Design a protein around this ligand. Structure first.
Ligand SMILES: OC[C@H]1O[C@H](O[C@H]2O[C@H](CO)[C@@H](O)[C@H](O)[C@H]2O)[C@H](O)[C@@H](O)[C@@H]1O
Ligand SMILES: OC[C@H]1O[C@H](O[C@H]2O[C@H](CO)[C@@H](O)[C@H](O)[C@H]2O)[C@H](O)[C@@H](O)[C@@H]1O
Lengths: 167, 182
């Protein structure tokens, strides 16, 4: 029994080793699916970008019509957001590495930066905002950072029209 | 006819046609592109579901075997829990004494046509309650009514949710052995 309990635990160790290999294989095959479809989708996101450029205030309105993102938007934040021209989400090619969100802003009284970028690593890198005279204030989320990041990546990004078109 | 044509002319001319139209056209063209995106999302989804079904079937006999082996080791699950940083903190010295009678944990997920998951806790005969199995389901959660013995009423507040359930399901279930040892 003291030996039998010992036999059982070695046997548990071996079964768990098989479990672990199978958990690893499943994760790898899933990740490859995501890597595959991230590549196939890229020409359509590019095209979709060009079309959104023809709808002024597309990204502001999309954000405003999203219950979670709106909770993140103060008065001046939303005014700054009027210079918001384009949002891109790019997942790193291997997917596991993380992703980046780019926010393009037209020339504005708030900051010098053309693009404000937030990167997520699997760790969080963001653009330093070159605020203009006395403008230093959403933009705090900029500097948990991954909740709004996931909302944009996973909710808004696949179908932003779902929010644009629905007050 | 003259008066009718006058009304018609006024209506069609007098009664924007750059910016509005541009917008409306763009929206229709974005929808077209979305349809391509959605088909791709659906293909990926299907692919991931086929991968998940395959490895689920591969994994199952091993998790079955692992449970039967676990039942031969006294204290496996207390030791696993006491060694887990978040479950350990919820165990008083009492709940720990009770968990010595805990022979078996099962986590069963029903995802296909969502019904959440279930954790079943099997106990040998013990001084604290009558129940052979204490279960909890999370979809927001159903739980076994514990039939305490006589002033034995006591972690087991959990059966009166999300965080602990997720910990056991997501952390410990796939590999309890890393806590049992480490
Ligand atoms: O792989 C299955 C998922 O496909 C979509 O999500 C991926 O594609 C999106 C763009 O269409 C990305 O924003 C996202 O990060 C990717 O995970 C779909 O939105 C999901 O519901 C599917 O499960
Ligand atoms: O298809 C049989 C069952 O597969 C899944 O369950 C197995 O895989 C899980 C992790 O992938 C293990 O945690 C579980 O113990 C295995 O039995 C699925 O969760 C079940 O609903 C399926 O019946």
């Amino acid at each position: 029994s003291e030996k039998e309990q010992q036999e059982a635990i070695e046997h548990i160790d071996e079964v768990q080793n098989e479990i672990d290999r199978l958990n690893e294989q499943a994760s790898e095959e899933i990740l490859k699916v995501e890597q595959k479809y991230n590549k196939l989708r890229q020409p359509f996101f590019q095209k979709r970008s060009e079309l959104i450029a023809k709808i002024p205030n597309f990204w502001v309105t999309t954000f405003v019509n999203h219950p979670q993102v709106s909770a993140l938007l103060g008065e001046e934040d939303e005014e700054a957001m009027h210079y918001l021209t384009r949002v891109e989400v790019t997942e790193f090619e291997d997917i596991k590495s993380g992703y980046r969100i780019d926010f393009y802003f037209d020339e504005n009284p708030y900051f010098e930066n053309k693009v404000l970028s937030k990167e997520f690593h699997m760790s969080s890198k963001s653009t330093e905002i070159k605020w203009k005279s006395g403008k230093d204030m959403f933009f705090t989320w900029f500097t948990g950072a991954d909740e709004l990041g996931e909302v944009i990546k996973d909710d808004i990004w696949p179908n932003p029209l779902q929010y644009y078109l629905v007050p």
